[PDB]
Each structure stands twice: as C-alpha cells, then as structure tokens.
Amino acid sequence: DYEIQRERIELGRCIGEGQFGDVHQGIYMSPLAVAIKTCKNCTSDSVREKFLQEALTMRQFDHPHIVKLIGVITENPVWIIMELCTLGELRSFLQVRKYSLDLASLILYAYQLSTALAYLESKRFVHRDIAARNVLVSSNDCVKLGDFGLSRYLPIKWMAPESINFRRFTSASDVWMFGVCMWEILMHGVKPFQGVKNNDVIGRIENGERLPMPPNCPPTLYSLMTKCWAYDPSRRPRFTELKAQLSTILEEEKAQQEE
Numbered sequence: 001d002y003e004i005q006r007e008r009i010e011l012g013r014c015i016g017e018g019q020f021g022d023v024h025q026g027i028y029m030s031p032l033a034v035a036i037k038t039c040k041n042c043t044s045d046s047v048r049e050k051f052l053q054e055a056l057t058m059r060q061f062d063h064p065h066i067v068k069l070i071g072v073i074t075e076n077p078v079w080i081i082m083e084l085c086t087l088g089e090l091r092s093f094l095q096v097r098k099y100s101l102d103l104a105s106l107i108l109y110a111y112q113l114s115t116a117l118a119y120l121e122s123k124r125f126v127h128r129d130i131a132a133r134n135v136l137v138s139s140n141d142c143v144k145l146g147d148f149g150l151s152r153y154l155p156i157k158w159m160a161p162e163s164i165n166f167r168r169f170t171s172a173s174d175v176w177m178f179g180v181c182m183w184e185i186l187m188h189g190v191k192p193f194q195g196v197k198n199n200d201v202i203g204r205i206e207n208g209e210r211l212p213m214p215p216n217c218p219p220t221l222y223s224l225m226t227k228c229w230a231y232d233p234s235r236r237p238r239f240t241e242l243k244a245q246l247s248t249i250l251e252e253e254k255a256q257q258e259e
C-alpha cells in the first residue's frame with residue numbers, strides 16, 4: 001500500500017513549481033527527507049487523475065539513480081510523496097561549485113545517469129526529456145534523474161534531428177539528448193545554444209556543426225559526446241555502450257587524480 005497518512009508528513013519550504021502546483025521538501029515519519037508534489041486544482045477529478053498517474057509512472061521503476069516514489073495522499077489536498085535529493089538541482093549545484101568540483105566527479109555524474117538511462121532502455125521506456133534541468137543531487141557523489149512528470153517540458157536545443165523533423169522518439173533520440181546533458185555537466189550547468197534562435201539550431205546541426213568541447217573536458221569524453229550526435233540514429237551508441245565507455249573514462253580520471 002502506497003497510501004500515506006497525512007499526519008506523518010511535515011511540509012517544509014517550497015523547492016520549485018510543478019505543472020500542477022508547488023513542490024516542497026519535508027519530512028516523513030514512518031512507523032526520512034521527502035519531496036512533496038502538490039496539486040492546486042485537484043478538486044477536479046480529470047486533473048486529479050493526470051496528477052496521480054505521474055505517481056504510477058514512477059512506481060514502475062527501481063534504480064539507485066532515479067528518484068523513488070515513497071507514496072501518495074489521495075484526498076484533498078492531493079499530494080505525491082517522493083524521495084528527496086537533498087542537495088537540489090544539478091545545474092545550480094554545478095554553477096555554484098564550478099571551481100571546486102573535480103573532473104572525476106563530473107564524469108561520475110555522467111556515468112551514474114548512463115546507468116539509469118541504460119536501465120530505462122532495458123525497460124523499453126523512452127524518456128524524451130533528458131536535460132541537466134531534470135537531474136538532481138542526493139549528495140556530492142550521487143546524481144539522480146528527477147520526477148518524470150516534473151521533467152515534462154519543445155526543447156529544440158536538446159532534441160535529436162529526427163525528433164524535431166518527424167517527431168521520432170526512440171532510445172536513440174534519448175542518446176542524442178544525453179550527449180547534450182553530458183555537455184551541460186562538463187560546462188558546469190550552462191545551457192546549450194545560448195544566444196541562438198531555436199530555428200537556427202536545426203540548420204547548424206544539418207551543416208555539421210556540434211556543441212564545442214567544454215574547457216578542460218577530456219577529448220575522449222568529448223569524442224563520446226560527438227558520437228551521441230551522429231545524425232543517423234542507427235549510428236549512435238547504445239546507453240549500455242556509453243556506460244562501459246564512461247566507466248573507463250571515469251577510472252582514467254580517478255587515476256590521474258591519484259585515487
């Protein structure tokens with residue numbers, strides 16, 4: 001049973017705004033730090049059903065680098081109780097720690113995300129919304145994919161060409177996005193294609209242009225990014241291959257950092 005008695009939740013401060021309402025952090029007293037998605041207008045049942053469907057989606061998954069559903073509260077106000085990633089949003093985390101976070105750590109986050117994404121592919125689940133904005137930090141040695149409902153955006157600057165042109169969404173278009181997500185992490189939480197109109201993004205990609213090597217990014221890691229950005233989706237690596245390749249790059253950097 002995933003139904004939670006409300007008296008066991010103490011609601012804390014607001015940590016962001018969802019499609020349905022504010023998200024709070026708080027504490028769960030079970031017989032635990034949590035996030036609480038709330039729902040402004042769940043007095044209506046059409047809204048309520050959509051909201052609560054987002055819980056069932058997260059219930060399907062069990063991975064150390066995807067946020068866990070703890071439970072739900074299904075009378076008004078209707079809440080979904082999720083695992084809290086204490087340290088918050090990745091982009092902010094990365095910006096604030098731009099000059100204090102080692103490269104091995106940045107690569108670690110890439111690797112961890114790739115294990116979750118390889119896991120989702122093996123569940124035959126296409127995500128569509130892989131971006132640093134949708135990653136969260138549990139601690140400084142652990143990132144996780146955020147809530148999938150909260151992740152829902154068109155994010156042209158992240159999307160694969162075939163997604164843009166023909167609305168093709170496959171694990172291979174997810175790979176393209178993850179490449180952009182990796183670029184973002186190594187760029188310390190800078191968005192891709194800033195100062196570029198969404199429309200010119202497509203033409204540039206067609207012209208052969210890709211996002212540039214982030215400063216201090218290992219060329220091996222950047223190369224791996226550019227393979228995610230093969231125009232032909234069949235020619236991109238599988239998430240399981242990125243996982244293996246990211247492990248070797250992680251271990252190489254750890255050895256360079258003498259650890």
Ligand SMILES: CN(c1ncccc1CNc1nc(Nc2ccc3c(c2)CC(=O)N3)ncc1C(F)(F)F)S(C)(=O)=O
Nearest residue numbers: 015016017023035067082084085088134146147150151
């Ligand atoms: C960025 N995301 C959000 N989009 C919209 C509203 C809220 C969130 C954040 N959601 C979460 N956030 C956290 N941790 C967290 C965050 C933000 C701060 C803090 C903690 C402390 C703080 O100051 N800000 N832990 C769990 C969750 C979750 F997904 F399980 F519900 S996403 C799409 O869920 O990745």
